[PDB]
Amino acid sequence: TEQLRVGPGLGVGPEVAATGGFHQFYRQLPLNINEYKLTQLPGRLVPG
Amino acid sequence: FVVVGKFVEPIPSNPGQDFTLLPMDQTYTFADPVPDTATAFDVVLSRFTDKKAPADLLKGATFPEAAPYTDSEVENISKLALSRVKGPDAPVLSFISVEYAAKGVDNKKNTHYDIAFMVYDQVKNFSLKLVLVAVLDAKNKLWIKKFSSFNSFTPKDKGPKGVENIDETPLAEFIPDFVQFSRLYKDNA
Amino acid sequence: ECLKQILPGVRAYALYVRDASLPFSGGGEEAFKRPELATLKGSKVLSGFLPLDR
Amino acid sequence: AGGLSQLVAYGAQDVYLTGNPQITFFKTVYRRYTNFAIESIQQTINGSVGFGNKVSTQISRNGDLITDIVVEFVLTKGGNGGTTYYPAEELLQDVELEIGGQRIDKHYNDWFRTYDALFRMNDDRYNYRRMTDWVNNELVGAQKRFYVPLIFFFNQTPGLALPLIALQYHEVKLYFTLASQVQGVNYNGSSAIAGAAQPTMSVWVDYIFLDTQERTRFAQLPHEYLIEQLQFTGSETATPSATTQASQNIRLNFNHPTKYLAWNFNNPTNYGQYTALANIPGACSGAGTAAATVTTPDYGNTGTYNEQLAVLDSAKIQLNGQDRFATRKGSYFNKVQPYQSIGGVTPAGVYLYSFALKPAGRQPSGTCNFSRIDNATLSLTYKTCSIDATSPAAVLGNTETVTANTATLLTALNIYAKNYNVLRIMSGMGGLAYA
Amino acid sequence: AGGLSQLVAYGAQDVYLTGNPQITFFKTVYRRYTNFAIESIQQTINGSVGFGNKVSTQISRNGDLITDIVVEFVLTKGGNGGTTYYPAEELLQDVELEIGGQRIDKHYNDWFRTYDALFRMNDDRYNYRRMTDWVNNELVGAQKRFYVPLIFFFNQTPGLALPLIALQYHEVKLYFTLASQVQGVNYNGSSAIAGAAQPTMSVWVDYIFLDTQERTRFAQLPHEYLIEQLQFTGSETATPSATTQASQNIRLNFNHPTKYLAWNFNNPTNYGQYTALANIPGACSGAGTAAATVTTPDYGNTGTYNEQLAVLDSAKIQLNGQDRFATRKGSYFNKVQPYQSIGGVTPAGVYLYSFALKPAGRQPSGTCNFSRIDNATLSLTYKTCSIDATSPAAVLGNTETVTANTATLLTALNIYAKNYNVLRIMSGMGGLAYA
Amino acid sequence: GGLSQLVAYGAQDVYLTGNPQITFFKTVYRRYTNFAIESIQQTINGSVGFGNKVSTQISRNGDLITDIVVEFVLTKGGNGGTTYYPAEELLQDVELEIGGQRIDKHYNDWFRTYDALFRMNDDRYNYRRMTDWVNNELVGAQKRFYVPLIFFFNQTPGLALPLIALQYHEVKLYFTLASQVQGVNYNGSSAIAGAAQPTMSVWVDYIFLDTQERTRFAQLPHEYLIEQLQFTGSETATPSATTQASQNIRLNFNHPTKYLAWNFNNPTNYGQYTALANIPGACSGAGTAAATVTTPDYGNTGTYNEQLAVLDSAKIQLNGQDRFATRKGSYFNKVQPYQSIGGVTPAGVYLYSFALKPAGRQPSGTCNFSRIDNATLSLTYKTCSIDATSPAAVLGNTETVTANTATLLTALNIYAKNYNVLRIMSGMGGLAYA
Amino acid sequence: EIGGQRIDKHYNDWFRTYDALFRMNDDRYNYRRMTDWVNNELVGAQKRFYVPLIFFFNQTPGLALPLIALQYHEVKLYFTLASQVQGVNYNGSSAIAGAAQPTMSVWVDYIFLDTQERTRFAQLPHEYLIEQLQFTGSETATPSA
Amino acid sequence: VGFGNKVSTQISRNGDLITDIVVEFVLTKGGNGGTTYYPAEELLQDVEL
Amino acid sequence: PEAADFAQFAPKNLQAQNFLTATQWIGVNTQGSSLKNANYDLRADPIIPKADVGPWMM
């Protein structure tokens, strides 16, 4: 066989043996669950 | 996308020599994510075989030659065939040894050979078994009928599907009547 | 839905008539088949004597 | 972050697992099946039911196909807890399956015991025991309804349901022989139990009612069912002794593609006794005390996993006089063979040799066709029966090649073979492709 | 010799097994599957927890599909070993599954107990107990985290993973009712335990993260899932008596294609008590000694396999007044039905009648549609409750048709059924096709 | 009766029985290839004895190989209660080498971990019957043990190793026998005078193929998707009586991993994954005055009593990001296997699956650690404040604590089971990825 | 329940709370007369009680539930009976020996429409503005001396 | 970790930038009040970046 | 697929037989309801326009 020996590094296809060194740039943020359950009501005034 | 510049800094006072520390981008892709075993070698070696010019229509009836194969006609024609692999992107294919070597003598003063040998691709760090069906005329011309890799000569078919479980018993077909429930719901509107 | 019942209906009837009309199914030895012994002991039955060649 | 961080880190090595994906796991397609219903119908038993009697039933045409058959018994304990051992199983001495006068198959009480010992397991085995014995320390006079499921090929899967509707010319009968005696019910060892009750028996058959489309096909079209059959012969066991390791060559009078062979040694006096008796806890009546005897088992604990009481030192099987595999210890056939081929835990004294990758299943997976073999022989070597069974230290501290002096009581050998045949049903008649 | 001597013995009888081969067992081709990842994510519980509280959670859109759900609880023993019985199961009184406001399903603590009694087995059954009870002889004050898995269709197989992603406009919710009392935790029979701690609770949902290609298809395509639902109704048991055989005609207020129907008789006082109490080991508090009483169970051993303590004598199900099967003994529903249909062991007092070949699985394999049965009835006959529960001789030496006088306390009847409906998802919303 | 169920057909049944595709009243058996299976003894090179290394080369007798069972004969160096899976302990390790390449390697502890986690019910009991003395046997008792191997080709015929296709490579199993086996040649640290040395035999079950299939194996290239075990030992943060130790253990693993499994143990006593205590079965003489909480009841070394386990909680993180929310240790001991295996796991043994069904053979989701720069297992230990000699202290205590004797469990064993591809062609085999 | 959906659900305590806030004067008294014994009845006395439901359609004709328009869906009422009732089967914590089990019956007042109105209700879609009760139980922070 | 020992850490790549770093120590008093002087500082003999 | 066209079958005039068996549709409801056909109101019960729309109306 060829014995590929893939290295570290995520966020890319299998064609890349290594992408990052000690700190890869790829980062993922959480989906911020229940974001629709927040209304964000504005403020209003009273009759002067 | 990284920006590499010149780093404008003041001129050094006493010396002129310093540490450069050139930029480097440590990332290595593969030529294919799955390791090549014999297919790439099969096409590159298949384009080096000769045409129908040998005309060795006869069966030959090759017989084996049990020997340690130190230095004889089998390894000589094997190295002669490996020397024919001189393409632009062709591998080096360092020769190793021969197993299952057969010679056949044709009444028209010909010598056919069925030589299986092992090669070691140094650029890819691995070994392969190649099949060389080559004949030799009386005028020392070595015609190669088929030069490819072993295990690439697959049989006619692979019958069993290779079930994973030992005993699972899949559900049998219903085998309906004259319409098989497809034309029944398709013909009606 | 009617054809789901009729198409098999027709089949059932036709096969019925076969059986109603003809003895057992109208078939032959295929139906009235005794088990095959299917063992090899008989392969070793030997001749008792040899004739003179003529 | 989270599960997404695993999903995103796809590499070269993952191509073999998910590249060019073919399947998923998160959406199941169930297949549409035919309409059917299952109903329990009581059958009529002809002949008198009782100990030692032979009775039979003819399965009625109360559905189209049949599967499960359960023989019910009502037994009354003739003694206290610990005096019986699977008594409903012992009672049903044998069962014969005949279609149109042709024997299809036949089971024996010992087979039911071997079959269970070898192929059932865990809670299944326990529940089975609950249906054939008293397992909650019941007392003398206790009355219980037992259920003995049959183990014929059509009693194991709907896929082999017997198409009674396709057997218009042939009747299907089950003949049942009841034992002359059952331990802890009407006899205690060799002694009759005065006042013991006769068993009440009933045979139940679970019928499959098909809808019109399928019912028609079964009634009208020919069928082929790959079926299992049990071959069985009894043999005298060469008797081992304190002075010797008996050896024996048993010709195996078997035929057909065989999935496996199974066997046991036993004491015909005590149902299910496949091991020597001993004064170690659970190995004999009264074991552990002054009253202990190694002439009578603790019936409720007749079976055991203590290999020290087994008698087979080693065995091999020859085909046409040639070794089939290297000789292995009896413990191989007791523990490893079923480990590999079944996955349950087989009691000491019960042995298996498989020819199949998975003999416990329905799908054939390698067979030994004995109809093509001239001399199949089982070669056995027995253990030296020198250990004084009345001294637990002698037993518990013994060596691999020896057993209890009481092991010489296991003079009967039962050899079974389970094979394939083909059941053909056509034009209202049926029988087997091979004899 | 060797394996080759078997291989060579090929003949006519082997053609059905190996001629023109279709499969091999010596080379497996694994299928390439889609990309996904699994993560266990804590959901927020809306509402205070503790005994008697009712809370709910909404499953957040963390992943695309959801399957397994485990409710964690932390309980502390209110007494010593032997005082509790599956207390985390008892605690979770019930769980309701709702999508878009439609009730999809609902389970009860007793259902979890009944389900387990019938469908879990062996080490799974034990491991389950380890997640809901104290099984290592723990003492008062012992604290453990318990894990109560849910058993809704999507909590059993990835195949029915709930497509939360395809329900873009519908919320998926779970309502959890906690018991007001849990035996051996905050109450001992009818008495409260001073100082008992209130439970801590958390709901964990295992999410499936799909890659883009699969995620998109789930989000955009319509779906039809064939799923199972629980139907449940409680009934009062015709009071068992020592004077006669109580009997009862129970209307079966059930609907939908039912894979099976199951029931149990219990003393509602004591969770999991499906049998009469008695002075035999494990059958009552203090059983076997001077302190024994048949008014309180050995809670740690509440369940039993000794049918003698089960009240049901016999039963049948009628559909529109017609017997759906011949009347069978309660022991038939307790032992044979689960032998045939499940393969585990069912505790005394729990009865199963299947309308399916394999009700323990996902493929319907035969159902009884009660939405087409004008008047289904369960007809039960009870044993005579004349056995002196405090006297082992009477408890253990009795007859088939009788039980303990204490069986009169099994005044509750729980009838359950599992059936198939369709969960349809379209245009971002979904719910069940049949009401 | 049954007929009324057929009649009672509604709209709801269309999804169950409309336009039938299948039937339950007909089975089709699939015709298969011709083959035979044979058990053949291998030659053991080297020298069998405690602490010795031996090896065997699999003879080319059949075409494919599957099961391998190692037989051992041991005698008891003491009475019942002194041994614990001694044949499992004895096979210290086994290495699978093809043509000089290490394909895999198992350790006695793996066999114990694997069994404890993935086997079950009567299979597990039978296994114990083949590796230990389970009928209260006494000193001097002799028994033959059978230790099955669990390499990918020993799990299923589907991965039978095609020796026929490996003409240029030999297949060897290298074994290390333990220097000591509890209750056989040593009792705790004390040698047992007169103990016998083991007798060993290695058996390989071979598959003999008929002509067409045999030829396909010999001539076709093959790619087997197989399992491998990765394993490293680590120093366990030592838990204590006053504080909860915590530790970040880097997971130096690679390849698509189905699951991680781990335990903490006292290396002195094989199979001890939990603390010892004066409660029945939890120590030698437990439950009485003579109880010693520093010496296990060897015959009852394993337990389901979580109180004696040391993991408070754990999480896995990848490149610093949480893989999943932190869960209590009992989750990895009871729920993970409840969800992914369906068996019961002994206290002190933990599993975290990245796969839907890790106990099967078909890939069902993996974590490829070869693509992670820093994979870490983060463990929080329980407080070891309980006086193990006082049952009340043990049995009536809280969630976050354990026995003071739990601090003896200083060896951390982390396993990872992954996939790779073993490609056979050119008469040689080898791995697709390193 | 309508069509498998929970529309609403009331509890005995809601009926008590509802009454406490919304019924009054003689309506409240007459209500009590239908759910209790208010004329100093004695032990053994038997009485038929009438407990009206207070779901939106039980309050006004304006919200009459169009059963005619729900041809494919069923409408159901599930009633849970208390395990104990004070002065009926329990006295404080003590069971009352000999206490009778309740008799129960559910009565529904049905509107019969003439042809034109009935047809429109059956065929037209409807939007009924209705009320629902939301309810949860909580632990009371307990005050002290 | 212990007195007189040299230990080290590679700062992980969990975020993008780093600012504050705090080394925590748990120490116990080997004598009464007045016997120590900023001992956490004394213990951390040096730190190399 | 089952029963291979038997052109040699003589009784092809199966007109004297009634193959339809309306035994499965006796007592059905709209889709799967169970109310014993619910013939309560002594009126005509007009047709309700059930349009096959999605989970919402519009």
UniProtKB/Swiss-Prot annotation, chain A:
Induction: Expressed in the early-late phase of the viral replicative cycle.
Superkingdom per UniProt: Viruses
Annotated compartments: Virion
Chain segments annotated as coiled-coil in the UniProt record: none
Function (record text): One of the minor capsid proteins that constitute a network internal to the major capsid proteins and outside the lipid membrane. The minor capsid proteins glue and stabilize the capsomers. Also acts as a molecular tape measure protein that determines the size of the viral capsid.
Domain notes: The hydrophobic region might anchor the protein in the underlying inner membrane.
Subunit-structure text: Interacts with the major capsid protein.
The name this protein goes by in its record: Minor capsid protein P2
Gene designation per UniProt: A342L
Curated annotation (Swiss-Prot), chain B:
Location of the protein in the cell: Virion
Induction: Expressed in the late phase of the viral replicative cycle.
Domain of life: Viruses
Keywords for the protein's UniProt record, in alphabetical order: Capsid protein, Late protein, Virion
UniProt GO cellular component terms: viral capsid
Endpoints of the signal sequence: none
Biological function: One of the minor capsid proteins that constitute a network internal to the major capsid proteins and outside the lipid membrane. The minor capsid proteins glue and stabilize the capsomers.
Domain comment (free text): The hydrophobic region might anchor the protein in the underlying inner membrane.
Subunit relationships: Interacts with the major capsid protein.
Annotated protein name in UniProt: Minor capsid protein P6
Organism: Paramecium bursaria Chlorella virus 1
From Swiss-Prot, chain C:
Induction details: Expressed in the late phase of the viral replicative cycle.
Subcellular location: Virion
Signal peptide (UniProt feature, chain positions): none
Purpose: One of the minor capsid proteins that constitute a network internal to the major capsid proteins and outside the lipid membrane. The minor capsid proteins glue and stabilize the capsomers.
Subunit structure and binding partners: Interacts with the major capsid protein.
Identification of the protein by name: Minor capsid protein P8
Gene: A644R
Residues of the full protein shown: 117 to 170 of 173
Curated annotation (Swiss-Prot), chain F:
GO molecular function: lipid binding; structural molecule activity
Inducing factors: Expressed in the late phase of the viral replicative cycle.
Carbohydrate attachment residues: N278, N300, N397, N404
GO CC terms in record: viral capsid
Keywords carried by this UniProt record: Capsid protein, Glycoprotein, Late protein, Lipid-binding, Virion
PTM entry text: Myristoylated at the C-terminus. Glycosylated; highly branched oligosaccharides. The pattern of glycosylation sites are unusual.
Highest taxon in the source lineage: Viruses
InterPro entries noted in UniProt: Capsid_N (IPR031654), MCP_C (IPR007542), MCP_C_sf (IPR038519), VP_dsDNA_II (IPR016112)
Subcellular location as annotated: Virion
Main location: virion
Pfam families hit by this protein: Capsid_N, Capsid_NCLDV
SUPFAM superfamilies tied to this protein: Group II dsDNA viruses VP
Signal peptide span: none
Other facts noted in the record for this chain: The viral capsid possesses up to five major capsid protein variants. They behave as asymmetric capsid components.
Its biological purpose: Major capsid protein self-assembles to form an icosahedral capsid with a pseudo T=169 symmetry, about 190 nm in diameter, and consisting of 1680 major capsid proteins trimers. The capsid consists in 5040 copies of the major capsid protein (hexamers), 60 copies of the penton protein (pentamers) and 1800 minor capsid proteins of different types. The minor capsid proteins form a hexagonal network below the outer capsid shell, stabilizing the capsid by binding neighboring capsomers together.
Family affiliation: Belongs to the NCLDV major capsid protein family.
Protein name (database record): Major capsid protein
Protein species of origin: Paramecium bursaria Chlorella virus 1 (PBCV-1)
